[PDB]
Design a protein around this nucleic acid. Structure first.
Length: 1273
RNA sequence: UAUAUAUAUAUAUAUAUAUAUAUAUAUAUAUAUAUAUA
RNA sequence: UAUAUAUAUAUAUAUAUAUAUAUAUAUAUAUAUAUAUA
RNA sequence: UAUAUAUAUAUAUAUAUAUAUAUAUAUAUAUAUAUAUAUAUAUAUAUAUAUAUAUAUAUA
C-alpha cells in the first residue's frame, strides 16, 4: 500500500501500533501527536492522490453555481430576515452562495480570509442594511461549518491512518477480517473528485478551516469562487465514509448515500433540501420489510407481568414466524418513490428496494441490512438564524373545530370562571379530571412539612438561568432595591444570583414582577428543527407550583406517569421490544406540537377553573408558600354578588390564570444576527426542560382516555372494531411522555385486525384531535418509535445517524472551551460507539487515533507566555478505553465492556500478573525486602518504565481551571452565603436541626476518634456548593489556566510508584475464569442489530447474559433509604457513609447526628437508622461503599443473576482456605463478586464463570485493612 | 354557452388471468479451479 | 487417472419478486353523440 | 430676588479614636521532622596491658 509509504515516519509507526503490529509506547505516542499539530491540514487531502479509485461516481459541476446572497436577505421592521427564495415559507436556512467577496486576508496565514472590518463596523455603527445582511450571512454560514467536535480533516486523517494497514488477526476463531476494502468506497472517491476543484499548484487548499471563534475561508482567485455548501458536503461525505466503514456496509448502499448528498448539494439551500427528504431512508427500509410471501424466522417471546404498572417483563422463549404473522400495514414504497421523483432520484429507491427484496426472512442479515441503510441519513447538526426560527415556530396558533361557547361559563370569580354542569364532551372530562386531582392536592399535610418546602425552594436554583435583567428592572420599577454581590465573581443571569437577591423580601411584594419578560435560547438538532429553552425567573417558577403539583399527582396516580419517573431510561427498552413482537399490534402517535397547541383560550382556562374550584375544599384562610389568603369578589349570582376569602393556592391560580391569559412575553437577543433584538408575546408554552413534560403528559393521557372510552365507541362503525375497542384502557394499553406516545392493541385472537378497521380507527382519531386543535401525526407501520428508540420484531435497531462521528452542537458563535475538555469529548464519543453496536475491533482502532491527537495541547497568555503539556497514553486506559496490545500479550483480547477506573486497572493487571512477575525477575535485580503481592521480582519499577503510574495519576488531575477568591468579595461571599442560607432556611426548625446535628457529629467523630475531617454531607454546605457552582460558571482568568498547566506537568513529572490504597489491596486477589455460563436465549434470535457472529464480542456478551433487565430479586439497589432529599447533596454519598458507619459498628447516636445533619427529625432519624442493616442491602448497594459501581455500558445487560449465582467468591474445591472470608463474608462477598465479574467482563469472548482462587494475604488481613481505610475516609 | 344523466372511444390507476424478459432462492446435470486420499 | 470436499461458471426444472405486452372488471380524467334543465 | 452673618441638615476630602476582615513581622506555647551534644544499652573496628598457643631469630 503506497499510501502507507506516503505517511511520515511517526504516523507510520502509529499505524503499525494501531494495526496491532507492536505494543504502543509513550515515545511514538508523542511523535505522532506532535507532528499532527505542526503540519498543515491540507496534506491530509494530499494523501488522497495515492488511492486508485474504481467506483462509478461523477461529481457534476452543478455544485459550483453560487446563488447570490444579496437576494437571500433583507431587513424590515428593523430585523434581518431570510426572505425565502421558493414560495415555501420554510426555506429559512443557509443559502448556497459564494462567500468570497466578503473576505479580507489574514496577516498570519495570507491565503485564508475573514470578514471585512469595514463591513462589521458599518453594520455596527451605521446599521447599514447591506452591511448587516452581509454580517448576518457570514456569521451563520461560519456557525454552520462550526457544528463539529473538531476539524473534519483531522477525522479524515484518522480514518486514513487506521485504514492504511489491515489489522493483525487474533487467535480467536471468530475474528473475521474486514470484508470491505478501500478503492471501493464511493465516498472517498467523491471527496477526491470534488476536491480536485480546490487545487492551484497541487496544494489542495481546504475550502474552510474551523477555529475557536468559528471558521475562516480561503480567498478564491479571480477565476474560481467557493460556495459555502461545498464545505458542508465534505463534512457529510467524511462522516458517511467513517460510518460506512465502521458499520461495514456494502459499497452499493454508500453509493446511494453519495448520490443522495450530491443531489442535495447541487440545489440551493443544501440544508433545506436535505431536510425536505429526510425520512426517505427509514420509510424505504424500516417501515416496509416483510411484505412478501417467503416470510419466516425466529422471534422473541416476551411476556408482560400482571402488575403492568410496574413495567416488568419476562423473556419466555421464542416464537416461530410464518406468513400469518407478517406485517399487515401497507408498505411505504409508493409515497417515497413519488417524493423521490421530484428530485429525480428514483434510481436510489429502485436500488434500495431491489436490495431489500433479498431479505425475505427475519434474521441477523435482515436487521443488519436495516441498520446499515438507516445509517445513511445525513448526520449534520442543522442551524438557521434564530430570528427566523423563533418567528417561524411561535407564529402558530391551534385551530379549534368546536370552541367552548361563551355561554358555557358561570359568572367570574375575579379572574376565573367555573364550567357549567350542563356542558359535556371532552372538555367536561378534562375539567373533572383536573378538578379531582386538585381536590386530592388540596388536603395534603405532605406539604407544610418544612423539609418538603425546602425541597421545592431548592429545586428552583441551578447554575444556569436567565431573565435576570427583566427581574432587576421590574423590581427596581416597583421601588424595590435589590442587593448586589458583583465582587463575588458570579454571573448575574444565573438563577442562583437572582435567588440570593430575593431571600429577604416579603413574597407578596414581588407579585407585580411575575408579569415580566423572559429571555430565550436555542439548541440545534440533528434531524429536526432546533429546540427551545425558555427559563422562567425564580418568582414565576415559584408561582406555577400548583400547576406542577397537580400534574405530578395526575401522572403518579394515573398510568404511573407513563415512565416519566425516568428512574432508569432502560425501562423503555423491554417495553418497545414487547410492543414490536408479532402477537401485538402497535401504533406510534405524538402531538404535532404540544408546546404550541396548549393554550389559554381552550385548554388553560379550563385547567385554571378546575384547579381553582378543586381547591375550594380546604381552609379558606391558609397561606401557602408565603402567599396569604385574600378577599375576592364572587359574581356567580347576578342577584346576590359578594366577596369571600380564598386560600393562598387559589390566589396563586388567580395570578397564574392572569399570566396565561396575558400570554408569555419573550425577548430575543440572537448573537449570530446583527443588532436586531426585540420582544414579542406568544401563547407558546415555555417547555424548556423536563418540568413541562408533566403537564403535557397529563393532558396527553386525559384526552386519549376520553377518546378510547367515550368518543370512539359512539362514533366508529365497524362492529368488530367496537368489540375489540371495548375492554381496553390506558393503564394497560397506552403510554406517553410529553408529546410522544405509544398505543398497543389487545392481542387479536391468533389473528390481526383488518387494515380497513385500522384506517377507520386512525381516521377517527385524527378528527378527534382536530376537534380541540391537536394534530395527532399518527402512523401505523408495525414498528416501535418511543423516545428515539427503534425496535423491529423484538430486536432493537440503533439509529446511528443520530450520533454522527464528526458532528457536535455549538449554540454560540464561539466554542468557548479549553483544550483539556477535548479528552472528555473523546471519552463520550467512544462510548456511543459501544452503546450503538459498531464493529468493536475497528471502532477501537479509530478511537485510539482520536485519543492520540487529543492527548496534546497548549495555551498562550493574552500577552505573555505560552504553555504546553500532553498525557501519557495510559491515562485513556484509566478513563475507560481498552488497550489494543500489551507487551507480551496478543492484540485484541480486551473487550469494550471493560469497566473504567480502578476496576479496569485491576482486571488488566490480574490477567497480566504472571508475565509481569516473571519478566521483571529476568530483567531487573530483586527489590530489597519482601512485598505483599509481588515476590522480590520488583514489577513496580517495570510499570514505571512503562509509565503506568504517570498515566494513572495524570487521569486523576482536574481539567477545568479554578476561579480565585477575594476578601471584600468574601463579604459578598458571606452576603451571598447568608442570603442563600436565608432562602434555604426560611423557617427556624431546619436550622436548629442541622446545627444540632453538626455539633453532635464533630463532637462524636473526634471524641469517639473515628476520624477528623470527614466531609459528611450536610445542609450547611449546600449553599457552599451552590456558590462554587455559580463562580465556576464564569470564564476563568488566564492565571488559573497557567496554574493548571504547571500543576498538571508537575503531577506528570513527580516520580510515584503506588496506586490508590484500594487498588493496592485489590491486587491481592487472584481471580480465574471457568467455562461459559449457560446461554440466556437462542443465539439464532437477533436482539440488537449488528450484535451478530460478525461482530462477535457484542454477540457473545448479549447472548450469554440476555438484554432484558430482569432483576426479579435484586432490584439493582434503587431502594435507597432516604427517598426524600434536598438538591445539591448526593444520595450515593449519604448511603455510602451510612453503610460505612454500620460496618464500622458506630453507636446509634452517630447515625442520629448524621441523619439530623440533613434535616431529618429525631423521630424519623431513629426510624431511618433502624432500617439500616447488612441483610436487606443489595450487592451493588453495599459494594458502592468502596466506590465499586456498575459501568454505564452494562446498563443494557441482565447482569443481576450472574453476579448473584455465577461469581463464586468461595468455591470449596478450588479456593485456597487462606481466602476464606469467614464471618465478615456478609459484607466481604459482594466486594469479591464485583471484582470477579469486572474481570470476567474485561476479556473478550463468551462470558465465563468467575472464581476467586487465592488472596496472597489472608482474607482477614484484607478485611482489616479495608476497615482501616473505611475508618480513615 | 353551462350543468346533470346515459352510451361509445382514448389515457391513467387498481385487481385478476395469460405470455415474454430480468433478478433472487432451492434442486439436478456438465465444465473449470483449489484442497485431501488412492 | 479416480474418489470426496469447497468455490465459480453454464444449462434445465421449481418457487418468489419486478418490469413490459394482451384480455376482463372497477375507478378517475378527456373527447364525441343523445336526452333533460337553465 | 441679591449680598453678609449665625444655626441645623446632607454630600465630599483630611486627621484621630473604636470595631471587623485580610496581609506581613516579632514573641510565647504545643505537635512533627532534621542536626548536634550528654547519659545508658548492643554490635563492629582500632590501640594499649596481661595470660595461653604456634612460628622465626639469638643465647645456654
Amino acid at each position: 500500500e503506497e499510501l502507507f509509504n506516503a505517511l511520515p515516519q511517526p504516523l507510520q509507526q502509529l499505524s503499525l501500533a494501531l494495526a496491532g503490529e507492536i505494543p504502543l509506547t509513550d515515545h511514538i505516542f508523542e511523535q505522532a501527536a506532535s507532528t499532527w499539530h505542526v503540519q498543515p491540514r491540507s496534506l491530509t487531502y494530499k494523501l488522497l492522490d495515492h488511492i486508485p479509485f474504481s467506483t462509478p461516481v461523477v461529481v457534476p459541476p452543478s455544485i459550483y453555481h453560487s446563488l447570490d446572497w444579496s437576494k437571500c436577505f433583507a431587513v424590515n421592521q428593523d430585523r434581518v430576515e431570510r426572505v425565502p427564495t421558493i414560495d415555501d415559507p420554510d426555506d429559512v436556512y443557509v443559502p448556497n452562495s459564494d462567500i468570497g467577496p466578503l473576505l479580507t486576508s489574514l496577516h498570519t496565514i495570507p491565503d485564508y480570509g475573514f470578514l471585512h472590518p469595514a463591513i462589521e463596523n458599518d453594520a455596527t455603527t451605521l446599521r447599514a442594511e447591506r452591511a448587516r445582511c452581509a454580517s448576518t450571512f457570514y456569521k451563520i454560514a461560519s456557525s454552520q461549518a462550526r457544528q463539529v467536535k473538531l476539524d473534519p480533516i483531522r477525522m479524515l486523517g484518522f480514518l486514513l491512518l487506521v485504514q492504511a494497514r489491515p489489522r493483525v488477526p487474533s487467535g480467536l476463531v471468530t475474528d473475521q477480517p474486514t470484508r470491505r476494502d478501500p478503492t471501493q468506497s464511493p465516498a472517498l472517491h467523491a471527496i477526491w473528485q470534488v476536491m480536485q476543484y480546490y487545487k492551484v499548484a497541487g496544494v489542495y487548499y481546504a475550502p474552510a478551516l474551523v477555529v475557536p471563534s468559528g471558521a475562516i475561508w480561503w480567498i478564491p482567485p479571480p477565476g474560481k469562487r467557493n460556495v459555502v455548501s461545498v464545505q458542508y458536503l465534505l463534512t457529510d461525505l467524511i462522516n458517511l465514509a467513517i460510518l460506512a466503514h465502521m458499520t461495514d456496509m456494502s459499497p452499493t448502499l454508500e453509493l446511494t448515500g453519495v448520490l443522495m448528498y450530491l443531489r442535495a448539494a447541487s440545489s440551493h439551500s443544501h440544508a433545506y433540501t436535505l431536510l425536505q427528504m429526510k425520512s426517505v431512508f427509514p420509510a424505504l427500509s424500516l417501515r416496509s420489510m416483510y411484505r412478501n410471501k417467503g416470510f419466516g424466522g425466529k422471534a422473541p417471546a416476551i411476556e408482560w407481568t400482571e402488575p403492568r404498572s410496574k413495567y416488568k417483563f419476562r423473556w419466555t422463549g421464542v416464537t416461530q414466524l410464518h406468513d400469518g404473522l407478517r406485517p399487515r400495514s401497507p408498505s411505504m414504497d409508493v409515497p417515497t418513490l413519488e417524493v423521490l421523483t421530484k428530485y429525480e432520484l428514483v434510481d436510489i429507491g429502485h436500488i434500495i428496494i431491489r436490495e431489500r427484496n433479498a431479505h425475505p426472512r427475519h434474521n441477523h442479515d435482515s436487521v443488519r441490512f436495516v441498520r446499515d441503510v438507516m445509517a445513511l441519513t445525513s448526520g449534520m447538526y442543522l442551524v438557521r438564524q434564530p430570528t427566523m426560527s423563533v418567528l417561524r415556530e411561535y407564529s402558530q396558533v391551534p385551530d379549534i373545530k368546536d370552541p367552548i361557547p361563551p355561554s358555557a361559563w358561570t359568572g367570574p370569580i375575579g379572574n376565573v370562571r367555573y364550567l357549567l354542569p350542563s356542558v359535556q364532551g371532552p372538555a367536561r372530562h378534562l375539567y373533572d379530571t383536573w378538578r379531582a386531582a386538585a381536590r386530592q392536592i388540596a388536603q395534603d399535610p405532605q406539604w407544610h412539612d418544612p423539609l418538603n418546602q425546602a425541597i421545592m425552594r431548592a429545586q428552583y436554583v441551578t447554575a444556569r438561568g436567565g431573565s435576570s435583567a427583566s427581574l432587576k428592572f421590574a423590581l427596581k420599577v416597583t421601588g424595590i432595591v435589590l442587593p448586589e454581590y458583583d465582587d463575588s465573581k458570579v454571573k448575574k443571569s444565573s438563577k442562583i444570583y437572582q435567588a440570593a437577591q430575593i431571600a429577604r423580601i416579603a413574597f407578596m411584594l414581588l407579585i407585580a414582577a411575575i408579569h415580566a419578560e423572559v429571555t430565550m435560547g436555542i439548541r440545534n438538532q440533528v434531524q429536526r428543527r432546533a429546540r427551545s429553552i425558555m427559563p422562567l425567573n425564580v418568582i414565576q417558577q415559584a408561582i406555577s407550583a400548583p400547576h406542577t403539583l397537580v400534574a405530578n399527582y395526575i401522572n403518579k396516580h394515573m398510568n404511573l406517569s407513563t415512565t416519566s419517573g425516568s428512574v432508569v431510561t432502560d425501562k423503555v427498552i423491554p417495553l418497545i421490544l414487547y410492543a414490536s413482537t408479532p402477537p401485538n399490534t402497535v401504533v406510534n402517535v405524538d402531538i404535532k406540537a404540544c408546546d404550541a397547541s396548549i393554550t389559554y383560550n381552550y385548554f388553560l382556562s379550563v385547567i385554571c377553573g378546575a384547579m381553582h374550584e378543586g381547591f375550594e375544599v380546604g381552609n379558606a384562610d391558609a397561606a401557602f408558600m408565603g402567599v396569604p389568603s385574600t378577599i375576592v369578589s364572587d359574581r356567580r349570582s347576578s342577584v346576590a354578588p359578594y366577596s369571600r376569602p380564598i386560600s393562598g393556592l387559589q390566589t396563586m391560580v388567580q395570578h397564574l390564570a392572569d399570566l396565561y391569559a396575558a400570554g408569555f412575553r419573550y425577548s430575543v437577543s440572537d448573537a449570530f444576527s446583527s443588532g436586531n433584538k426585540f420582544s414579542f408575546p406568544t401563547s407558546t408554552f415555555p417547555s424548556g426542560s423536563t418540568a413541562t413534560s408533566t403537564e403535557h403528559t397529563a393532558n396527553n393521557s386525559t384526552m386519549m382516555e376520553y377518546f378510547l372510552n367515550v368518543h370512539a365507541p359512539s362514533h366508529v362503525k365497524s362492529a368488530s372494531l367496537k368489540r375489540i375497542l371495548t375492554d381496553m384502557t390506558i393503564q394497560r394499553n397506552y403510554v406517553c411522555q410529553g408529546d410522544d406516545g405509544i398505543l398497543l392493541l389487545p392481542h387479536e385472537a391468533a389473528s390481526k385486525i383488518s387494515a380497513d378497521d385500522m384506517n377507520e380507527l386512525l381516521t377517527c382519531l385524527r378528527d378527534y384531535g382536530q376537534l380541540f386543535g391537536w394534530n395527532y401525526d399518527i402512523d401505523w407501520s408495525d414498528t416501535a418509535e418511543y423516545l428515539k428508540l427503534y425496535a423491529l420484531m423484538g430486536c432493537r435497531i440503533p439509529n446511528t445517524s443520530r450520533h454522527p462521528p464528526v458532528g457536535k452542537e455549538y449554540a454560540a458563535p464561539q466554542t468557548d472551551e479549553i483544550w483539556p475538555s477535548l479528552i472528555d469529548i473523546v471519552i463520550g464519543h467512544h462510548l456511543n460507539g459501544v452503546t450503538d453496536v459498531l464493529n468493536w475491533r475497528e471502532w477501537l482502532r479509530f478511537s485510539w487515533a482520536f485519543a492520540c491527537y487529543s492527548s496534546r495541547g497548549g495555551y498562550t497568555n493574552p500577552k505573555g507566555q505560552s504553555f504546553s503539556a500532553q498525557y501519557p497514553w495510559w491515562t485513556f486506559v484509566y478513563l475507560g478505553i481498552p488497550p489494543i496490545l500489551l507487551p507480551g500479550q496478543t492484540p485484541f483480547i480486551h473487550s469494550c465492556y471493560m469497566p473504567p477506573g480502578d476496576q479496569g486497572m485491576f482486571s488488566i493487571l490480574n490477567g497480566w500478573r504472571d508475565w509481569l512477575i516473571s519478566h521483571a525477575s529476568t530483567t531487573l535485580p530483586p527489590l530489597r525486602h519482601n512485598h505483599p503481592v509481588w515476590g522480590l521480582s520488583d514489577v513496580p519499577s517495570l510499570l514505571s518504565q512503562f509509565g503506568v503510574y504517570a498515566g494513572y495519576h495524570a487521569a486523576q488531575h482536574y481539567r477545568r481551571p479554578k476561579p480565585a477568591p477575594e476578601t471584600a468579595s468574601s463579604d459578598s461571599i458571606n452576603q451571598i452565603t447568608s442570603d442563600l442560607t436565608e432562602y434555604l432556611f426560611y423557617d427556624s426548625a431546619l436550622k436548629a436541626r442541622v446545627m444540632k446535628g453538626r455539633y453532635n457529629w464533630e463532637r462524636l467523630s473526634s471524641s469517639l476518634s473515628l476520624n477528623v475531617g470527614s466531609r459528611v454531607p450536610s445542609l450547611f454546605d449546600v449553599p457552599g456548593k451552590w456558590v462554587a457552582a455559580g463562580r465556576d460558571a464564569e470564564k476563568p482568568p488566564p492565571s488559573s489556566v497557567e496554574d493548571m498547566f504547571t500543576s498538571l506537568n508537575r503531577c506528570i513529572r513527580r516520580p510515584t510508584h503506588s496506586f490508590s490504597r484500594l487498588l493496592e489491596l485489590y491486587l491481592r486477589v487472584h481471580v480465574t475464569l471457568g467455562e461459559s455460563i449457560p446461554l440466556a436465549i437462542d443465539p439464532d434470535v437477533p436482539q440488537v442489530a449488528g450484535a451478530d457472529p460478525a461482530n462477535d464480542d457484542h454477540w457473545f456478551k448479549y447472548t450469554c447474559l440476555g438484554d432484558i433487565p430482569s432483576a426479579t430479586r435484586n432490584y439493582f439497589g434503587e431502594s435507597l433509604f432516604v427517598g426524600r432529599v434536598v438538591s445539591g447533596l448526593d444520595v450515593e454519598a449519604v448511603d455510602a457513609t451510612l453503610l460505612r458507619l454500620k460496618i464500622l459498628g458506630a453507636p446509634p447516636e452517630a447515625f442520629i447526628a448524621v441523619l439530623n445533619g440533613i434535616g431529618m427529625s429525631d423521630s424519623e432519624a431513629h426510624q431511618i437508622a433502624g432500617r439500616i442493616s447488612l441483610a436487606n442491602a443489595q450487592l451493588v448497594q453495599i459494594a458502592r461503599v468502596v466506590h465499586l459501581s456498575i459501568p454505564s455500558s452494562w446498563m443494557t445487560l441482565n447482569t443481576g443473576p450472574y453476579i448473584h449465582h455465577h461469581a463464586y467468591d468461595f468455591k470449596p474445591g478450588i479456593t485456597q482456605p487462606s481466602a476464606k472470608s469467614r464471618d465478615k463474608s456478609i459484607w466481604m462477598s459482594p466486594i469479591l463478586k464485583l471484582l470477579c465479574t469486572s474481570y470476567a467482563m474485561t476479556v473478550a469472548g463468551p462470558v465465563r464463570t468467575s472464581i476467586v482462587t487465592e488472596i496472597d494475604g489472608s482474607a482477614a488481613a484484607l478485611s482489616g485493612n479495608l476497615r482501616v481505610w473505611m475508618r480513615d475516609v
